[PDB]
A and B are shown apart, each in its own frame.
With several copies, the nearest count.
Chain A
Amino acid sequence: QITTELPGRTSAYRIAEVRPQVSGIILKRNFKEGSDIEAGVSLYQIDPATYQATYDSAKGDLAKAQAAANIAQLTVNRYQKLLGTQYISKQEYDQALADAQQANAAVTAAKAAVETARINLAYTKVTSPISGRIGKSNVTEGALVQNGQATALATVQQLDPIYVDVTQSSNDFLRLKQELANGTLKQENGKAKVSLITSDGIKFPQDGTLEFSDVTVDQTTGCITLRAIFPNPDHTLLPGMFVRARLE
């Protein structure tokens, strides 16, 4: 006639820590905190004028490589049709082919620059990595941020399901293996349900799906992470709560 209650802290089903990917100055924030964010929804906007000069500079030098490559291409095309005659020999023909190959090196650097300013041009704007509920913003607008810096931009969460980390020290990990050895906690051997006692005592409107097998043994305490994926259709079960649960 139902078994023991114990606490375990809940955690999100999935977080993602939004981090900057271009060094620059923060222009307009494109969201609000604690809000439902989807993947690809824009978040901040770094001022693209530096990358506008970078972008159009890359396209202009791209047109330069199209110009010189057009020159060498036409010299090859009009040294090609007259070989083996008194018109053109192999010498200036291979001069034109040296112009053509070195021109392909110039076009190679050109596509390097256009691809570079196009990926950098892509990372001007700040969008969301994945979907789900954002945490807080960290930096306000008009502020210099760096690529790959320690200060993340935000952290989205994701709660239609929700985890609980189910701590138990080694001294009654043997007692959890006493109820495991009784086999009376563990019937389906994977995930079966466990009722969900939060702070007011008023439980969750359904029980939660407890995983059984993944007994994450600590190096120090044996404290378990049974990754306790629980239904949160309300999306408001607050990863961070220290609440309890009792088994079946």
Chain B
Amino acid sequence: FSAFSSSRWEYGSPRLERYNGLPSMEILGQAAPGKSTGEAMELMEQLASKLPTGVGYDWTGMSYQERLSGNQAPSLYAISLIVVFLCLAALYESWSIPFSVMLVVPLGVIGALLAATFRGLTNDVYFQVGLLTTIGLSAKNAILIVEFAK
């Protein structure tokens, strides 16, 4: 081969990557505890200002899920409050007499909040359904109350 072959050295990465068919490199990152990853999005996207022209980026993983939406939940708590308000406006069958029991809607979050702190656990879907259990049982019991007075 040396009758005709020169040779030399250089670089080259074995594992190249392209994301959505576009030249990419894998950028993992975990945040320090106590700071949401959307704060890291605001941080690195304002550090994505420190990028040349013709450069883009992506947030995926569960950051793809939150990249779609972190929480459309408060829209559903909103229209949940709506549908609770009107359905109780049928069960009461009364104008704004239901609004009383709306006051005891937040009275189930209490030991959820504080007991979640005193044991030291944060929000997730189990926490969300914990909210659902509290409001359902609690507000249910209050409907037994206003039904008995009713």
A and B touch in the complex (CB under 8 A): yes
Q: Which residues of B contact A171 (CB under 8 A)?
A: 2
- For A221, the closest partner residue in chain B by CB is B3
Count contacts on B: residues with CB < 8 A to the other chain: 2
* Residue A169, interface by CB 8 Å: yes
* Chain B residue at minimum C-beta to C-beta distance from A170: B3
Interface string of B1-16 (1 = CB under 8 A from A): 0110000000000000
Which residues on the B side are within 8 Å of A172 (C-beta)?
2
Chain B interface main SS type: loop
Bits for A167-201, please: 1 = Cβ < 8 Å to B, else 0.
00111100000000000000000000000000000
Return A29 CB to nearest CB of chain B, in Å: 33
Write out the residue numbers on chain B whose beta carbons fall within 8 Å of the beta carbon of A221.
3
The residues in B between 45 and 84 inclusive whose CB is less than 8 angstroms from any CB of A are none
User: How close is A222's CB to chain B, nearest CB, in angstroms?
Assistant: 8
Chain A residues, CB < 8 A from B2: 169, 171-172
In whole Å, how far is A11's beta carbon from the nearest beta carbon of chain B? 21
Taking the closest CB of chain B, its distance from the CB of A145, in whole angstroms, is 35
Which residues of chain B are within 8 angstroms of A170 by Cβ–Cβ distance? 3
B3 contacts across to A, CB distance below 8 A: 169-170, 221
Q: Which of A202-242 contact B (CB under 8 A)?
A: 221
Q: Which of A137-172 contact B (CB under 8 A)?
A: 169-172
- Taking CB atoms and an 8 Å cut-off, the chain B residues in 1-41 that contact chain A are 2-3
- In the assembled complex, how far is the CB of residue B4 from the closest CB belonging to chain A, in whole angstroms? 10
Q: Could you tell me the distance in whole angstroms from the C-beta of A26 to the nearest C-beta in chain B?
A: 36
Residues of B within 8 A of A169 (CB): 2-3
Chain A 112-130 interface mask (CB, 8 Å, partner B; 1/0): 0000000000000000000
Which residues 67-112 of B have a CB within 8 angstroms of A?
Answer: none
Residue of B nearest to A201 (CB): B6
| Nearest A-chain residue to B2, judged by Cβ | A169
B6 to chain A, nearest CB (A): 10
Shortest C-beta distance, A182 to chain B (Å), equals: 21
Residue of B nearest to A171 (CB): B2
Shortest Cβ distance from A173 into chain B, in angstroms?
A: 12
Nearest-CB residue, chain B, relative to A169: B2
Shortest distance between the CB of A216 and any CB in chain B (Å) = 18
Question: C-beta contact mask, B123-141 vs A, less than 8 Å → 1, else 0?
Answer: 0000000000000000000
Q: List the 6 shortest-distance A-B pairs measured between CB atoms, nearest first.
A: A169-B2, A169-B3, A221-B3, A171-B2, A170-B3, A172-B2
Between-chain CB contacts (< 8 Å), 6 pairs: A169-B2, A169-B3, A170-B3, A171-B2, A172-B2, A221-B3
